[PDB]
Amino acid sequence: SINNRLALVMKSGKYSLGYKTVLKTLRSSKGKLILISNNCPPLRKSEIEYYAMLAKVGVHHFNGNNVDLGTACGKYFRVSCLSIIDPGDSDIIKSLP
RNA sequence: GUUUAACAGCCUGCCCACCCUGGAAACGACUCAGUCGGAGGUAGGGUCCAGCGGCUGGAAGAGCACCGCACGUCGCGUGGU
Ligand SMILES: [K+]
Numbered sequence: 001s002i003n004n005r006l007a008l009v010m011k012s013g014k015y016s017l018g019y020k021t022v023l024k025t026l027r028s029s030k031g032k033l034i035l036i037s038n039n040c041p042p043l044r045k046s047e048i049e050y051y052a053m054l055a056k057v058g059v060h061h062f063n064g065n066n067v068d069l070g071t072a073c074g075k076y077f078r079v080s081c082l083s084i085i086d087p088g089d090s091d092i093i094k095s096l097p
Numbered sequence: 098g099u100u101u102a103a104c105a106g107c108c109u110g111c112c113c114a115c116c117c118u119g120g121a122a123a124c125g126a127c128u129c130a131g132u133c134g135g136a137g138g139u140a141g142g143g144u145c146c147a148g149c150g151g152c153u154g155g156a157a158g159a160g161c162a163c164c165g166c167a168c169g170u171c172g173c174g175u176g177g178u
């Protein structure tokens with residue numbers, strides 16, 4: 001399940017939550033996978049997709065809104081998008097492709 | 098009774114709004130009340146907006162108060178604080 005893998009990444013991996021940090025990781029090429037929620041504004045989603053295409057980074061469309069993504073990440077706030085800098089014990093980067 | 102107009106310049110910069118750095122749970126900030134924050138808070142530094150705000154020019158030469166000299170019939174006279 002995507003949620004279980006995300007929880008495993010949260011408890012054992014490196015990540016950044018938020019649009020600005022996601023763009024920073026994409027610019028720095030440190031991010032390896034970008035997750036975008038349905039709630040994400042269309043323009044922001046398009047910009048993130050363009051950045052990921054430029055950086056050759058996979059993009060996954062989370063099956064939920066920002067509230068659901070934040071809940072899956074274990075946080076009490078909304079998460080519009082997140083970047084997986086390093087999956088510790090998970091294999092999302094390997095399973096998704 | 099012990100005053101300072103329009104207008105010109107400089108300064109200031111309410112409550113908001115906005116920008117840059119950064120990335121937050123042991124959640125924090127915060128109002129009389131609320132509310133705000135990974136759609137980026139707290140924090141640090143800035144931009145802008147109001148003013149019937151400040152200083153200067155206008156403008157002390159004016160106005161007001163007080164104290165005097167003089168013509169003493171007609172100087173709307175003359176001086177000081
Ligand atoms: K006027």
Ligand SMILES: [Mg+2]
Pocket residue numbers: none
């Ligand atoms: Mg005088």
